[PDB]
Amino acid sequence: RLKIVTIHQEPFVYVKPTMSDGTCKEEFTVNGDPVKKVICTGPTVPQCCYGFCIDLLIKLARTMNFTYEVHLVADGKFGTQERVNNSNKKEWNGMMGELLSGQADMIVAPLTINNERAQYIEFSKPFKYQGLTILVKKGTRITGINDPRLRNPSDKFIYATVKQSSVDIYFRRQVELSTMYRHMEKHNYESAAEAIQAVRDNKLHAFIWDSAVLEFEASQKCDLVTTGELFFRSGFGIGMRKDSPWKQNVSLSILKSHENGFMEDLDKTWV
Ligand SMILES: NC1(C(=O)O)CCCC1
């Protein structure tokens, strides 16, 4: 019974309360198809989880003949390396920390495959190809990471991302993006929800984040749109501890799904 850890992140993983009898409300898609849901414990009581990643998990479990139990990451984070003591060895938090500690056997979430994480865990082939993009108010046009309003910032156009995120780290390490980072570090938000709200409230002109997330957020709000070319393209993959016996088949299934329309069907169903 594999321990699956995930996190709230629509449309990949929705999190809702169970009904009074402890079950998940029976719901259907706009075309009458049943919405598959799994019970996921977390911040701790049983809750209802569903979405792109849950549909993927259900498919993998069926295809690979395994049972599982899902829980939401305890600290509500994806995972970054942080100094937590006087030693010289940083420690991973979020889902990365849980996978490495054994609290989880697989990370099933919109987790970016990057260099730092790849140094400690292994990933399946990507179940989603995306990259960083920009969220702005309808009518605003930004070409991409090279747009002057970003490279030559001023207070007339404020942009930012989420503090302590892997995206924040991406800019902090990009020497060529020092100018941008200096500007962002002065406006970064505590959470994506807050930043997205700030964009609708005209308090923030641009929010830099995952295109896989922003494309959905934009589709849900008419006053919001994504703009420009993607930069820092990346994939989302299932995380497992090194040398896992599940890796090969998880990867083969995902590659097969990209080739047989299954992944395209999830795209249409959830966005
Ligand atoms: N995909 C993210 C990650 O850290 O894995 C990047 C920002 C949202 C979460």
Side-chain angles (χ1 to χ4, degrees), residues 1-87 89-136 138-140 142-162 165-171 173-175 177-181 183-184 187-263 265-271:
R1 208 144 185 279
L2 313 200
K3 293 178 180 61
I4 307 297
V5 65
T6 190
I7 190 175
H8 181 201
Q9 182 78 291
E10 291 164 35
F12 295 89
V13 182
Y14 286 73
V15 183
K16 303 291 182 178
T18 53
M19 297 187 286
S20 62
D21 66 354
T23 66
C24 296
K25 181 174 182 56
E26 174 181 57
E27 305 191 87
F28 305 79
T29 64
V30 290
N31 49 65
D33 191 60
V35 175
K36 294 179 290 302
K37 304 182 177 182
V38 305
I39 291 293
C40 51
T41 53
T44 63
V45 303
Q47 305 175 61
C48 298
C49 280
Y50 55 90
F52 187 115
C53 284
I54 303 311
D55 274 2
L56 180 60
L57 169 61
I58 288 172
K59 171 69 175 183
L60 289 170
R62 178 86 173 192
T63 299
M64 291 176 65
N65 195 199
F66 70 70
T67 52
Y68 59 89
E69 45 181 47
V70 182
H71 74 271
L72 296 162
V73 58
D75 67 4
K77 300 177 178 63
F78 278 81
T80 63
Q81 265 192 300
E82 305 301 309
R83 168 182 166 175
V84 298
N85 50 49
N86 292 302
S87 81
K89 191 171 79 69
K90 288 180 176 293
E91 300 287 351
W92 288 93
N93 60 192
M95 299 184 283
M96 282 292 295
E98 285 198 21
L99 179 62
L100 287 170
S101 74
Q103 300 172 68
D105 292 316
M106 279 189 185
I107 296 178
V108 182
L111 186 69
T112 301
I113 298 166
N114 64 29
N115 171 281
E116 207 183 329
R117 292 168 180 167
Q119 290 176 43
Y120 298 77
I121 68 165
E122 291 178 340
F123 297 82
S124 68
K125 292 291 179 281
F127 58 78
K128 175 68 177 178
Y129 288 99
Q130 60 117 220
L132 292 181
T133 193
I134 310 164
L135 182 73
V136 299
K138 182 183 178 61
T140 298
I142 294 295
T143 68
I145 191 62
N146 301 304
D147 191 294
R149 282 195 285 182
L150 269 53
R151 309 310 285 271
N152 291 171
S154 80
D155 293 317
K156 294 186 179 181
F157 192 83
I158 300 178
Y159 55 96
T161 190
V162 181
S165 64
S166 60
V167 180
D168 184 35
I169 295 301
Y170 167 71
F171 282 89
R173 296 180 178 174
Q174 266 278 183
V175 56
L177 304 178
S178 60
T179 301
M180 287 188 78
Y181 181 71
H183 172 284
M184 279 179 266
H187 304 80
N188 287 338
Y189 285 69
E190 221 59 279
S191 68
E194 289 174 287
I196 296 174
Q197 183 59 57
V199 172
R200 309 190 67 178
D201 293 354
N202 300 299
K203 295 244 62 61
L204 177 61
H205 302 94
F207 172 45
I208 302 172
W209 204 227
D210 276 349
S211 64
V213 171
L214 298 185
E215 276 176 46
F216 172 72
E217 288 300 310
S219 71
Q220 297 301 297
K221 304 168 181 179
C222 289
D223 66 309
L224 264 40
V225 307
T226 58
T227 181
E229 284 192 59
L230 300 192
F231 53 101
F232 181 16
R233 282 173 186 283
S234 60
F236 288 160
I238 292 182
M240 297 162 275
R241 283 182 293 280
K242 300 186 65 176
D243 290 338
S244 174
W246 309 307
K247 188 178 66 182
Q248 181 65 357
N249 287 176
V250 166
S251 282
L252 290 181
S253 177
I254 286 170
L255 287 172
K256 197 68 173 181
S257 289
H258 278 294
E259 306 173 21
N260 70 188
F262 184 79
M263 225 57 103
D265 287 312
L266 284 185
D267 292 343
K268 290 177 292 181
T269 299
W270 298 103
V271 171

